[PDB]
Amino acid sequence: XXXXXXXXXXXXXXXXXXXXXXXXXXGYSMFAVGIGALLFGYWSMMKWNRERRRLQIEDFEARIALMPL
């Protein structure tokens, strides 16, 4: 009996298949989150600066109140 190297292909490994595809981001939907984070960013920040004004006037009031200084 002769024994040589046997042939096997099975699945053929798929000859040239695309793996690159669009994922997560679509296009217009990313701008809704992108610019949406900006509008949420300013509104949250400016409310803190209005709360800073409560401290600001109260800080300068200490100088006016102190005349024996």
Partner: peptide, 9 residues
Amino acid sequence: LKAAAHHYG
């Protein structure tokens, strides 16, 4: 101590 109280105004 003086700066802590604004009631001095």
